[PDB]
Amino acid sequence: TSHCRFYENKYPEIDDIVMVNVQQIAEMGAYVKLLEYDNIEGMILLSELSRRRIRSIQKLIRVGKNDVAVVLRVDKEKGYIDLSKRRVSSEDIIKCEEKYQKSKTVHSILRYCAEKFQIPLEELYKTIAWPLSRKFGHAYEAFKLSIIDE
RNA sequence: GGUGAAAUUCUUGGAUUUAUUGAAGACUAACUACUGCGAAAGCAUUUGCCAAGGACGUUUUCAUUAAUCAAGAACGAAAGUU
Ligand SMILES: [Mg+2]
Ligand SMILES: [Mg+2]
Ligand SMILES: [Mg+2]
Ligand SMILES: [Mg+2]
Ligand SMILES: [Mg+2]
């Protein structure tokens, strides 16, 4: 079960870049799920969805696929996000790519660990990934070190 | 910044705005109007100098010296050329 968000808390921060998989589209916008963080839903509105004039949404969004975005407002009581998509700079997307790729590696490795040990990812992340992220900022550099220095 | 909306561009070597100032070059807002001057272009900050001009007033002076003009000439917006 893929849960237990990458970061040390399940909620977003006010300015961050993130990457999102679209789940559906409504008329006012799309309330979609975050993948840089665990599962929390939030709106992306059509007015702040496309760069150019919004002529089509099917071509741009491509529901079921991965896109870059940022977060502007946060609901820190029960969980709701306001996100943005047009304000992604040419430099933003590159670092979003690298951050999501390292996160995806560290997620798939420990997902395999959970599947082979049949223990929820929450406990495994709390026991292993979190202290390593505390110590060296991200667990992937720790994995590289463990390859080199044990 | 900018735009229908964006992007290019400048920014924690702190831009955008904030106060004093300093430099440069342009130009003369509002007053500015069915208003003025000039042959036409054109002419709008102040002051001085330089000469010029229309209009009016004139019981001033000369007495046709005038009108339009091929040839010839003077100015001639903007742009452009040394
Ligand atoms: Mg300043
Ligand atoms: Mg003036
Ligand atoms: Mg006048
Ligand atoms: Mg002639
Ligand atoms: Mg010239």
Amino acid of residue A8:
E
Closest C-alpha to A38, from A9, A62, A64:
A9
Domains A16-91 and A92-150 share a fold: no
A91 touches strand B (CB under 7 A): no
A87 touches strand B (CB under 7 A): yes
**Structure solved via:** cryo-EM
**CATH superfamily of the A16-91 domain:** Nucleic acid-binding proteins (2.40.50.140)
Resolution of the experimental model, in Å, one decimal: 3.3
**Topology of domain A92-150, per CATH?**
DNA polymerase; domain 1 (1.10.150)
Domain ranges of chain A: 16-91, 92-150
Report how far apart, in Å, the C-alpha atoms of A15 and of each of A63, A70, A88, A113, A139 are: 24, 7, 11, 33, 23
